[PDB]
Amino acid sequence: GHMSDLSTAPTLDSLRVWLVDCVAGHLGLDAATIATDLPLTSYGLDSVYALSIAAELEDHLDVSLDPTLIWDHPTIDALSTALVAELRSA
Numbered sequence: 001g002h003m004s005d006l007s008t009a010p011t012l013d014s015l016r017v018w019l020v021d022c023v024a025g026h027l028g029l030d031a032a033t034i035a036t037d038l039p040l041t042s043y044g045l046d047s048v049y050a051l052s053i054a055a056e057l058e059d060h061l062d063v064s065l066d067p068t069l070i071w072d073h074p075t076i077d078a079l080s081t082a083l084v085a086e087l088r089s090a
Contacts, residue, residue, distance in 0.1 A: 010087055016080045022057055039074035061086075 006014055016036075024031035027043060035042045040050065050070055058065045063086060073079045 012084050015083045019076045036076045
């Protein structure tokens with residue numbers, strides 16, 4: 001019913017959906033067929049794209065990403081895991 005935001009207490013569903021939804025909006029394609037199970041390469045984006053794009057994404061969640069790290073989590077599964085981790089250590 002009520003759409004929960006995060007209240008400093010984000011949920012895996014809110015993030016995971018954020019990532020896929022983020023790409024969908026970015027490219028404009030359908031989220032159900034974005035690439036949640038595929039890397040960013042599928043978008044055919046240049047290396048310079050990740051810089052600005054990866055910056056915009058993380059800039060939205062008030063966080064900074066690492067260089068070799070971005071190429072480490074090119075998928076939503078990894079990125080989401082890392083994102084939720086920001087709220088959960090272990």
